[PDB]
């Protein structure tokens, strides 16, 4: 039913910041989950998947920074660590789901700002 | 793989949810009247 | 390579009661795997059509999808004062998924 | 099988160094228990000190 996100903030470039997003209402477990990016004034750009029902991780090669994705399924939560930062990634992120002709499960988080800059 | 059903009371009578319970039975090696000896019984 | 999307027009300033056709074109032949979203700027993207030809709960038939292959169509009809927002198409054919650049329907 | 996982046993003298003789070993069912689970894999247990 509901998705909550870890806190965004201002991080210096080259660093790492683990992204937590917990589910509620129905589990993460039976589904997949995604991350997308929205820069201000820019379109929604897909980032990376997670696939718990086997195990596989796909990343966008457009932003191929080894932003690692894995689970905490028993907390219905998902972790993607912001690795190899660069300033144009300063944006808001969303926890996502795609209706793949079968489901209607597209549920979106509230959105938190990741900021990549040396100036706080 | 999976899909939901769509249930509302706006559905017709053919689209109403049934709570089907199925009972299944068996018989195995798994399981008082006084004993009668030499009587057709 | 990647699958390119082509969302046209990328904006359309509109009026009350219109019937706007927001087109999302595709670089490949995608079966029906395209969606549509409502986003007022700052909200969560509320899904509108799934599999490019099917409506959604809460969203009446003032929105209406069709198309297949390369050509996909957002059929907005009887344009309502709440429908003026920034919208999006969506592939799910391959990996990577890309989204359209958005189409802001806004009051003339 | 069939909700009953049954255990069998036997105890036999053997004078050979390791492997088995030519004799027949009859195993009675010990207990016939309601198990109802499919068991696809296992390992033995040990006693160490």
């Amino acid at each position: 039913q509901q998705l909550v996100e870890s806190g965004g903030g201002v991080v210096q470039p080259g660093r790492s910041l683990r992204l937590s997003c917990a589910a509620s209402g129905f589990t993460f477990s039976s589904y997949a989950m995604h991350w997308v990016r929205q820069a201000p004034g820019k379109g929604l750009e897909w980032v990376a998947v997670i696939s718990y029902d086997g195990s596989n991780k796909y990343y966008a090669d457009s932003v191929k920074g080894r932003f690692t994705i894995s689970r905490d399924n028993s907390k219905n939560t998902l972790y993607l660590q912001m690795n190899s930062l660069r300033a144009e990634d300063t944006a808001v992120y969303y926890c996502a789901r795609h209706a793949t002709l079968m489901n209607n499960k597209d549920i979106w988080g509230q959105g938190t700002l990741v900021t990549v800059s040396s100036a706080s | 793989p999976l899909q939901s059903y769509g249930f509302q009371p706006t559905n017709g009578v053919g689209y109403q949810p049934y709570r089907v319970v199925v009972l299944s039975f068996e018989l195995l090696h798994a399981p008082s009247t006084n004993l009668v000896k030499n009587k057709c019984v | 390579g990647d699958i390119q999307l082509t969302q046209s027009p990328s904006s359309l300033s509109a009026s009350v009661g219109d019937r706007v056709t927001i087109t999302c074109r595709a670089s490949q032949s995608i079966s029906s795997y395209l969606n549509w979203y409502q986003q007022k700027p700052g909200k969560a993207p509320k899904l509108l059509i799934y599999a490019a030809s099917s409506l959604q709960s809460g969203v009446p038939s003032r929105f209406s999808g069709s198309g297949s292959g390369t050509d996909f169509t957002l059929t907005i009809s009887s344009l309502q004062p709440e429908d003026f927002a920034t919208y999006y198409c969506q592939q799910s054919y391959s990996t990577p998924r890309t989204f359209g650049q958005g189409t802001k329907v806004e009051i003339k | 099988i069939d909700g009953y996982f049954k255990i069998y046993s036997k105890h036999t003298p053997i004078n050979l160094v390791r492997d088995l003789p030519q004799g027949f070993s009859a195993l009675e069912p010990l207990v016939d228990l309601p198990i109802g689970i499919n068991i696809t894999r296992f390992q033995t247990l040990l006693a160490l000190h």
Side-chain angles (χ1 to χ4, degrees), chain A residues 1-81 83-105 107-120, chain B residues 1-25 27-41, chain C residues 1-70 72-108, chain D:
Chain A
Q1 289 174 356
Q2 186 176 0
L3 295 171
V4 71
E5 304 182 1
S6 68
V10 178
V11 182
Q12 293 180 358
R15 289 182 176 178
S16 294
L17 180 62
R18 183 182 291 271
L19 290 172
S20 175
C21 186
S24 293
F26 188 75
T27 68
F28 165 71
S29 66
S30 179
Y31 291 111
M33 207 67 71
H34 292 170
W35 283 100
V36 299
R37 177 173 65 241
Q38 189 175 4
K42 278 78 175 176
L44 301 171
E45 291 180 353
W46 173 79
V47 178
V49 304
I50 191 172
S51 63
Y52 176 70
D53 300 333
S55 181
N56 195 356
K57 52 180 75 174
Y58 290 160
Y59 300 151
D61 288 330
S62 62
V63 181
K64 181 67 176 178
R66 290 183 294 274
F67 295 94
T68 181
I69 182 67
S70 290
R71 62 171 177 85
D72 195 357
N73 52 1
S74 298
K75 291 186 180 180
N76 292 322
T77 312
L78 56 103
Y79 292 164
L80 185 141
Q81 187 178 3
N83 298 112
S84 70
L85 295 173
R86 57 195 185 275
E88 67 273 21
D89 302 335
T90 296
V92 68
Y93 281 1
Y94 281 101
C95 310
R97 176 60 183 166
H98 294 176
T100 316
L101 190 143
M102 302 297 288
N103 309 116
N104 288 320
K105 299 302 289 184
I107 302 302
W108 299 85
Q110 70 272 19
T112 51
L113 290 172
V114 288
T115 301
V116 180
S117 66
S118 297
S120 179
Chain B
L2 303 178
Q3 187 185 1
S4 177
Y5 287 158
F7 285 120
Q8 295 86 13
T10 65
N11 294 325
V13 68
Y15 295 163
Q16 292 178 352
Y18 288 164
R19 287 194 174 187
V20 175
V21 58
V22 175
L23 300 176
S24 304
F25 314 121
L27 57 92
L28 281 80
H29 281 169
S32 63
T33 59
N34 201 26
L35 210 95
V36 175
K37 291 171 184 175
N38 320 312
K39 207 158 77 180
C40 168
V41 284
Chain C
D2 293 332
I3 298 169
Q4 294 294 321
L5 292 176
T6 300
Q7 184 180 3
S8 65
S10 297
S11 180
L12 190 146
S13 180
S15 297
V16 176
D18 293 334
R19 186 173 180 178
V20 178
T21 302
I22 296 168
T23 317
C24 186
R25 293 181 61 87
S27 65
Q28 294 180 357
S29 180
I30 291 93
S31 177
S32 66
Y33 295 163
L34 185 142
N35 299 320
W36 295 98
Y37 292 99
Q38 180 179 1
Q39 184 179 3
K40 288 185 179 181
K43 301 292 184 182
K46 184 176 180 179
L47 180 62
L48 297 177
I49 299 298
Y50 69 101
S53 64
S54 298
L55 298 176
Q56 189 63 42
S57 177
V59 175
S61 66
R62 62 177 181 265
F63 298 95
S64 177
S66 66
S68 178
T70 64
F72 293 94
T73 286
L74 181 61
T75 306
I76 302 170
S77 74
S78 178
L79 182 59
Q80 301 296 321
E82 71 272 16
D83 293 333
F84 293 96
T86 299
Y87 292 165
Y88 288 97
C89 65
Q90 181 187 3
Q91 72 176 0
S92 65
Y93 187 80
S94 175
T95 302
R97 274 72 177 169
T98 60
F99 298 160
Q101 68 271 15
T103 300
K104 185 175 180 180
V105 178
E106 62 186 1
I107 300 169
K108 187 181 289 184
Chain D
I1 58 172
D2 67 16
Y4 285 93
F5 173 82
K6 289 176 292 297
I7 299 171
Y8 301 85
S9 65
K10 185 67 179 296
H11 301 293
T12 304
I14 181 170
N15 289 279
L16 194 146
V17 292
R18 295 183 297 103
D19 292 345
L20 279 64
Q22 296 299 323
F24 296 96
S25 297
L27 280 71
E28 76 285 4
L30 295 178
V31 293
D32 51 352
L33 281 181
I35 297 276
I37 182 173
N38 186 30
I39 294 169
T40 190
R41 185 174 61 256
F42 66 94
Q43 186 178 356
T44 187
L45 290 174
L46 294 166
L48 305 177
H49 60 75

